[PDB]
Amino acid sequence: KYRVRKNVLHLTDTEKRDFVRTVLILKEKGIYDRYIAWHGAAGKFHTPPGSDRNAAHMSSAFLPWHREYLLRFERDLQSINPEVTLPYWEWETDAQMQDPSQSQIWSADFMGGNGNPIKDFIVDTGPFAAGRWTTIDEQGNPSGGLKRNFGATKEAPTLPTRDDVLNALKITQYDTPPWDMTSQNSFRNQLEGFINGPQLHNRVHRWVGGQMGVVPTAPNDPVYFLHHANVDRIWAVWQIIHRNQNYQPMKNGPFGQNFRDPMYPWNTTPEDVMNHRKLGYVYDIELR
């Protein structure tokens, strides 16, 4: 209950500077690519082999895996700069904007802007613009510049709304069998976004486009971590509302999805990360 994770829009100009800089040091040092690599590797670790589920997505472990992923990322930020925490992108109130692409998350001091359609939607404003920041493909080889193309697809012309978030929060079951992209009455799968998708989390991905629009390479965009810090906040809220409800499956789901299974590529289990305050951080909304 010590590290405060703040709304992106409520950050000072100096917090934005410090956060963007630290991400660049992680990337210069070779550390950032550990996260890209981990994310792609998890998407090829199917539970069970030959299943549609993987360690990080499309199953029950979606939420705690990303919680652990962000915790490691944030710990790496703090070794470079202890006054830096992982902010969250509250996309559901950007969606209420007249033009959500006008949100200050996309200003040249922070994430940078939409892609340049003259440059095949390469990003050229902000600290991760082409030239300043090199992306990596699934094979681990340099893949050019970061790309974004906001709202360009028919399936996801808008960010999720606050009504979308509130409605996912009424769901009482953390997850339901068969613990996959077809789970019904499942807050995991509703938040993940496969319920007549892409909704919520999956929709944000498709709305941003570029690397963000395909899951394995999505973390090539630093906004991936801000996005998932929002998802993690929403999960943390659901845990406060539905305090009697617990992770599922407790047991007899596929190996790597049960409460006490290790989450590849780590030994960390869902149980280890069930209490976010226990990991040493809160979201600013929990404190007024």
CA proximity to 132, closest of 210, 39, 23: 23
> Is residue 227 a known part of a binding site?
no
DSSP secondary structure letters along the chain:
--EEE-BGGG--HHHHHHHHHHHHHHHHTT-HHHHHHHHHHHTT-BSSTTSS-BSSSSSTTHHHHHHHHHHHHHHHHHHH-TT----B--HHHHTTSSSGGGSGGGSTTTT---EEGGGTTEE-SSTTSTTT-EEE-TTSSEEEE-B--TT-STT-SSPPPHHHHHHHHH---S--TT-STT-SS-HHHHHHT-TTSS-HHHHHHHHH-GGGGSTTTGGGSTHHHHHHHHHHHHHHHHHHHTTT---S-SSSSSTTSSTTS--TTSS--GGGGS-TGGGTEEEGGGG-
> Is residue 228 a known part of a binding site?
yes
Nearer to its own copies, 41 or 285 (CB): 41
> Is residue 163 a known part of a binding site?
yes
Q: Is 24 in the site for its own copies (CB under 8 A)?
A: no
Q: What residue 48 binds from its own copies, Cu ion, none (CB within 5 to 8 A, per partner kind)?
A: its own copies
> Is residue 201 a known part of a binding site?
yes
* 3, β-bridge pairs: 281
> Is residue 46 a known part of a binding site?
yes
Q: Is 29 in the site for its own copies (CB under 8 A)?
A: yes
Tell me which residues in 50-69 interact with its own copies (CB under 8 A): 50, 54
Q: What residue 216 binds from Cu ion, its own copies, none (CB within 5 to 8 A, per partner kind)?
A: none
Q: Is 264 in the site for its own copies (CB under 8 A)?
A: yes
Rounded least distance, CB 36 to its own copies, Å: 9
Tell me which residues in 15-74 interact with Cu ion (CB under 5 A): 56
Nearer to Cu ion, 124 or 137 (CB): 137
Relative to beta strand 3-5, strand 115-116 is: unpaired
Residue of 256, 259, 270, 272 interacting with its own copies (CB under 8 A): 256
Q: Is 45 in the site for its own copies (CB under 8 A)?
A: yes
Contacting range for its own copies; rule: CB under 8 A; set: 48-56, 91-99, 146-154, 192-200: 48-56
Contacting range for its own copies; rule: CB under 8 A; set: 101-109, 170-178, 203-211, 264-272: 264-272
> Is residue 205 a known part of a binding site?
yes
Tell me which residues in 98-157 interact with its own copies (CB under 8 A): 134, 136, 138-142
Residue with tokens 């799968």: 189
The token duo for 108 is: 């040249």
Residue of 12, 14, 49, 287 interacting with its own copies (CB under 8 A): 49
Relative to beta strand 281-283, strand 122-123 is: unpaired
Q: Is 47 in the site for its own copies (CB under 8 A)?
A: yes
Residue of 24, 265, 279, 284 interacting with its own copies (CB under 8 A): 265
Instruction: Report CA torsion sign: 153, 154, 159, 165.
Output: negative
Q: Is 48 in the site for its own copies (CB under 8 A)?
A: yes
| Interface residue list for Cu ion (CB under 5 A) | 56
What residue ranges bind its own copies (CB under 8 A)?
Answer: 29-31, 33-34, 37-38, 40-41, 44-50, 54, 134, 136, 138-142, 254-256, 261-262, 264-266
